[PDB]
Amino acid sequence: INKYFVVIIYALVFLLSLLGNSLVMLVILYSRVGRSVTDVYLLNLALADLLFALTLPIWAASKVNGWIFGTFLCKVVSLLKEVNFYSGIWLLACISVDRYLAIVHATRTLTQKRYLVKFICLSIWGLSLLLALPVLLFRRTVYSSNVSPACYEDANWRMLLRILPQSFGFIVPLLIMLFCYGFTLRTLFKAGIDCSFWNESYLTGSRDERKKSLLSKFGMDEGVTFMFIGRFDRGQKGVDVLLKAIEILSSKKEFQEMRFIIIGKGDPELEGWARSLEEKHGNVKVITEMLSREFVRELYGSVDFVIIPSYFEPFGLVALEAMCLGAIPIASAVGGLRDIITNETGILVKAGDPGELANAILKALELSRSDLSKFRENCKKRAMSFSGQKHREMRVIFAVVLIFLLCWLPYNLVLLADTLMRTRNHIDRALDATEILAILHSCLNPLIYAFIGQKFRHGLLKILAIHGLIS
Numbered sequence: 001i002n003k004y005f006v007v008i009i010y011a012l013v014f015l016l017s018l019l020g021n022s023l024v025m026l027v028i029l030y031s032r033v034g035r036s037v038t039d040v041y042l043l044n045l046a047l048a049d050l051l052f053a054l055t056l057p058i059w060a061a062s063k064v065n066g067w068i069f070g071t072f073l074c075k076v077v078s079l080l081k082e083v084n085f086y087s088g089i090w091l092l093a094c095i096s097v098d099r100y101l102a103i104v105h106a107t108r109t110l111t112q113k114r115y116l117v118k119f120i121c122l123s124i125w126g127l128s129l130l131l132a133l134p135v136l137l138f139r140r141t142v143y144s145s146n147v148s149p150a151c152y153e154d155a156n157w158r159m160l161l162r163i164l165p166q167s168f169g170f171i172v173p174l175l176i177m178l179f180c181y182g183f184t185l186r187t188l189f190k191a192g193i194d195c196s197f198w199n200e201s202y203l204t205g206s207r208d209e210r211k212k213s214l215l216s217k218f219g220m221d222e223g224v225t226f227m228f229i230g231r232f233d234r235g236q237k238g239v240d241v242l243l244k245a246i247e248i249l250s251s252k253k254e255f256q257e258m259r260f261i262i263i264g265k266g267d268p269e270l271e272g273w274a275r276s277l278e279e280k281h282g283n284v285k286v287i288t289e290m291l292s293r294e295f296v297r298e299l300y301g302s303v304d305f306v307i308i309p310s311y312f313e314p315f316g317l318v319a320l321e322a323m324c325l326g327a328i329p330i331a332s333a334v335g336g337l338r339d340i341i342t343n344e345t346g347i348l349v350k351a352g353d354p355g356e357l358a359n360a361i362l363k364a365l366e367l368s369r370s371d372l373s374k375f376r377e378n379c380k381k382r383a384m385s386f387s388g389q390k391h392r393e394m395r396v397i398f399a400v401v402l403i404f405l406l407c408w409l410p411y412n413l414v415l416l417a418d419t420l421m422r423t424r425n426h427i428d429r430a431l432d433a434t435e436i437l438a439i440l441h442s443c444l445n446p447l448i449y450a451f452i453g454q455k456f457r458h459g460l461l462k463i464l465a466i467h468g469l470i471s
């Protein structure tokens with residue numbers, strides 16, 4: 001029956017994990033050079049999967065006939081399969097902690113004191129053994145009426161020893177993983193800009209001289225400048241908020257002190273309102289033309305402030321470009337924009353309020369009195385921090401975690417469903433199908449490195465070239 005197939009898959013995975021993880025441990029251990037804190041954690045993960053692989057042929061014979069191998073051998077096998085999970089899930093959380101402090105925050109960890117990394121994973125294996133200590137007490141050979149011997153568990157303390165590793169060995173590292181991986185992915189998405197195009201170095205002369213010449217080119221008098229480079233639309237780029245803010249500013253004396261440049265094509269009702277304001281005020285300029293990135297670069301450097309009153313912005317790409325050339329952004333607190341803009345690098349406002357934006361334009365007017373040379377420079381530093389990219393290296397780790405959860409989450413979710421049922425054939429075969437999914441993981445990580453793992457790929461053929469391989 002289905003029993004023959006199980007033994008095939010078990011023997012098939014066993015080999016793919018043995019060779020797989022052994023190759024991975026070799027490639028990591030061969031050269032100490034270039035090996036990172038993450039490479040150390042991935043090496044421990046490879047060993048955790050390598051140990052669990054060893055129990056698979058004993059588990060294969062356990063399907064044909066029951067658990068005959070011994071009461072002791074149950075504890076041996078049961079500890080390795082539990083330790084492999086708790087260690088593997090905790091090692092993945094340590095990768096998250098390292099990558100969070102390194103990508104979303106600009107802080108390298110344990111680089112100077114690399115000896116401490118060894119103690120971290122030693123602690124991981126230890127905590128993993130203590131988490132799996134109750135199964136060393138309650139897991140043995142269980143005999144029943146007319147059925148083959150089996151390997152499974154059986155007071156109030158026994159449930160506590162099952163509830164304690166359920167939350168601290170599954171939910172606690174998972175919680176840390178969701179916060180860290182989630183917020184790293186968020187900032188990973190944001191940087192798409194190339195500092196080879198948008199840079200301060202490419203600009204000629206000084207930012208105040210570039211401004212006076214821009215105004216002279218735009219037929220406007222000397223003063224503080226505000227720029228808009230979004231699309232003319234309702235409910236997305238919020239040009240209507242800007243045209244209404246200009247309208248309420250119109251009545252004030254401080255309005256004559258400032259100049260406005262509203263660039264963008266779109267909505268004919270918004271195009272009209274922008275042209276009417278241009279024709280009425282000598283300090284308002286509107287460009288319907290679709291300008292080239294070379295001209296926009298000259299604008300970002302010369303103009304003092306860039307206003308982004310966008311209702312929805314998933315990525316602050318227009319702010320990233322503006323900040324890379326040293327323009328203080330007056331953007332509404334929305335997606336991407338709340339993250340990139342700090343009280344040190346721009347002004348944040350309420351999304352759909354034209355009254356509050358006018359007060360931010362007025363606030364920016366008063367802040368310009370003092371030399372904002374450092375404030376403009378801070379924006380260049382902050383945008384650039386986002387500019388550095390690891391995104392390609394991380395694509396491997398995201399595949400690792402994605403596949404880990406796709407293999408272990410269905411087993412743990414079915415585990416809760418059958419334990420809380422006490423406290424069916426459809427749910428019995430469900431646990432039989434989620435079992436083989438968690439087994440398949442044991443050989444998947446090496447395959448991921450063999451597919452998209454750029455350090456492992458090159459590193460493996462680097463060793464092959466040293467000994468055998470040629471041309």
Ligand SMILES: CC[C@@H](Nc1c(Nc2ccnc(C(=O)N(C)C)c2O)c(=O)c1=O)c1cc(C(C)C)co1
Nearest residue numbers: 027034035036038393394396449453454455456459
């Ligand atoms: C799985 C084995 C493989 N490790 C790999 C990656 N790891 C990393 C992934 C993301 N971020 C880091 C990191 O934290 N930084 C500081 C770059 C990694 O290290 C890969 O990508 C990849 O492949 C490897 C490494 C080596 C040598 C360097 C010893 C040989 O094989």
